[PDB]
Amino acid sequence: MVEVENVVHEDFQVTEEVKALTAEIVKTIRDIIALN
Amino acid sequence: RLAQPYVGVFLKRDDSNESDVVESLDEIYHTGTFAQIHEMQDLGDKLRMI
Amino acid sequence: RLAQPYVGVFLKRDDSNESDVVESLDEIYHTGTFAQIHEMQDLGDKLRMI
Amino acid sequence: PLYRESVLQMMQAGQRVVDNPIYLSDMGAALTGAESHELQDVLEETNIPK
């Protein structure tokens, strides 16, 4: 069956704050594994 | 060994690059922040300066 | 910033009065107990010198 | 919420302890989430009201 790798991965040209969500995401992942 | 311990804190420019950090000195901003070192720890990593 | 960090300790004469301690230098006794500084802490008060 | 609020209770303007207001305005601007480029833009301004 026909298929194609349309793995869109857009990101802003300015990569300074774009990782700021990552800090909260890892702190959240730490809190989910820590309570559960 | 030095009598007075201290360190300076600078800010890097846009598009961070480790190779530029060891290749060029223009990546750093003109602004600087001297301060005195407090105490070394290196609890887990070997470089945990304050 | 000084090469040798230190602080003195003197003893006050009778009838303590902070205004005279900051105004005149005669209230304190000539005897003194100089010593080198270790490390600041300031856990609760902003002035907790050892 | 981001940081704990007792530090705001430790340095209050009515205590008259803020001999250096610019450190307080810097501590309060530090709570912003803006890009380090935006902080550098705030640093580019020279006049205090600006």
UniProtKB/Swiss-Prot annotation, chain A:
Subcellular location(s) per record: Mitochondrion matrix
Tissue expression as described in the entry: Duodenum, heart, lung and liver, but not thymus.
Disulfide bond positions: none
Top-level taxon of origin: Eukaryota
Family of the protein in this entry: Belongs to the peptidase S16 family.
Physiological role: ATP-dependent serine protease that mediates the selective degradation of misfolded, unassembled or oxidatively damaged polypeptides as well as certain short-lived regulatory proteins in the mitochondrial matrix. Endogenous substrates include mitochondrial steroidogenic acute regulatory (StAR) protein, DELE1, helicase Twinkle (TWNK) and the large ribosomal subunit protein MRPL32/bL32m. MRPL32/bL32m is protected from degradation by LONP1 when it is bound to a nucleic acid (RNA), but TWNK is not. May also have a chaperone function in the assembly of inner membrane protein complexes.
Pathology noted in the entry: CODAS syndrome: A rare syndrome characterized by the combination of cerebral, ocular, dental, auricular, and skeletal features. These include developmental delay, craniofacial anomalies, cataracts, ptosis, median nasal groove, delayed tooth eruption, hearing loss, short stature, delayed epiphyseal ossification, metaphyseal hip dysplasia, and vertebral coronal clefts.
Comment field on protein domains: The Lon N-terminal domains are crucial for the overall structure of the protein, maintaining it in a conformation allowing its proper functioning.
Subunit architecture: Homohexamer. Organized in a ring with a central cavity. The ATP-binding and proteolytic domains (AP-domain) form a hexameric chamber, while the N-terminal domain is arranged as a trimer of dimers. DNA and RNA binding is stimulated by substrate and inhibited by ATP binding. Interacts with TWNK and mitochondrial DNA polymerase subunit POLG.
Record's protein name: Lon protease homolog, mitochondrial
Source organism phylogeny: Eukaryota, Metazoa, Chordata, Craniata, Vertebrata
Region of the whole protein represented: 272 to 307 of 959
